[PDB]
Design a binder for these strands. Structure first.
Lengths: 261, 261
DNA sequence: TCGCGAATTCGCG
DNA sequence: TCGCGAATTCGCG
């Protein structure tokens, strides 16, 4: 609703854009807001690129590479901006994951389990793989003071409120979100150090314990806690907000370009 | 071979001990070496415990918990030592993972694939889940200057040298370790920032970029790079070494107990 | 009982 | 071709 944001947002909703297309929409919106800056979208980053960023931090880092052409491909891609030095800086990395088919199985009156007599499927743990790409981007951005990694959760395994699903035969199945039978949210909280979910954690926090003053890279973790599908318009707003925050942290290195125009 | 280490090591080999039993063996060996100190083995840590450790770092951390009794269970468990303050400090967390059945499929002359005409199975990505528990322990140990997390890889997906497997009918299948068809080692290198694999990285490194001086928590990643099974004796030595290093970093807080005896 | 973990086959481009 | 990703069912105690 924030001017053009409202407009782009309606477009995303009208086309139920996938997270990757929403990232491309964020890039376009950024270019619109900041005509003097240069933005780009990339769907992947090579492991050699990460290693090079790591080496700049410390020569002993980023020394391993078993498969030469190895890489990562966040399903939401990556958006970057060119700084006054000509270097590309990450402003957004988005990822959307799914897990838990219970709401669909119930609506279909389809029992599950090895005996096909269960209303619910004990939730799996594949979502844990999400920590790998978060770690890869944190490493790639180790020199940065922001970490614009956003993860969108969807499914019966990421509930934040109790919901009710009615079977075809009319029987109603009540789901308690705090049930370990299905809730796998605690499998992702390590990624943002237990900070609040559904929040923009792009600005890195620094902490200490022994005159340490260490930097934390917290992913912003969002979930559609009612088991429904994500609204592309809200994903767009979340993502545009994160990206805007990236630009703020990167401000000192964008001044020259905002001037000369 | 280092005195009692040689002895315990032969015992582990003689019983082909699983990683978890090897951790218990490390605890016993530590107690033997340091009779004045108190050690313990635990097979799990509750998410409430992690949250509490996080809160001590900064009040805004460790605030989320959806399933009250949520926890983590490293298959190798955890070994801790009691410090002069009466607090338990982690000296070792071990985990062993497997992936890649090619060497077994070839030895059995069993073709694979949707058409059952392939020598090799394109490797999966489940191993990526390993990053979750590494992140959980890093968070639990955020106040520590050491991170004794050791991961042991085994399978055809973690090769570091080319090997040859002969079929029943005599046909020999040659595997190139640098092939992305099977090698998934690059899926774990983010966990130690690209530092050397098969090495003790227990002592946290500090780096900087902008007067930052940030702390890195690098997991020690070991692989049986020839596709063979792990030798429990060598796992024991690796683990005892990591644990010994933990005690060294924790030395200032163990002095009192080593004295009074 | 509830809740963590195993790690797989094959789609995709 | 090669190499990243989807996310699942059910064992286990």
């Amino acid at each position: 609703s924030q001017g053009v944001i409202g407009i782009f947002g309606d477009y995303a909703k009208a086309h139920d854009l996938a997270v990757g297309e929403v990232s491309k929409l964020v890039k376009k919106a950024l270019s619109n807001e900041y005509p003097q800056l240069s933005f780009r979208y990339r769907d992947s980053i090579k492991k050699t690129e990460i290693n090079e960023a790591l080496k700049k931090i410390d020569p002993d880092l980023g020394g391993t590479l078993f498969v030469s052409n190895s890489s990562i491909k966040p399903d939401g891609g990556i958006v970057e901006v060119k700084d006054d030095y000509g270097e590309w800086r990450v402003v957004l990395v988005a990822e959307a994951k799914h897990q838990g088919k219970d709401i669909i199985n119930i609506r279909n009156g389809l029992l599950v389990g090895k005996r096909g007599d269960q209303d619910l499927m004990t939730a799996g743990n594949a979502i844990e793989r999400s920590h790998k790409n978060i770690s890869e981007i944190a490493n790639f951005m180790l020199s940065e003071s922001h970490f614009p990694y956003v993860l969108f959760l969807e499914g019966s395994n990421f509930l934040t409120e109790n919901i009710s699903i009615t079977r075809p035969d009319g029987r109603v199945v009540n789901l308690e979100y705090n049930s370990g039978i299905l809730n796998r949210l605690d499998r992702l909280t390590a990624a943002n150090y237990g900070m609040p979910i559904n929040s923009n954690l792009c600005i890195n926090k620094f902490v200490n314990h022994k005159d340490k003053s260490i930097m934390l890279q917290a992913a912003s973790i969002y979930t559609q806690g009612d088991g429904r599908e994500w609204d592309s318009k809200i994903m767009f707003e979340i993502m545009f907000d994160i990206s805007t925050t990236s630009l703020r942290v990167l401000g000192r290195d964008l001044f020259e370009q905002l001037t000369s125009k």
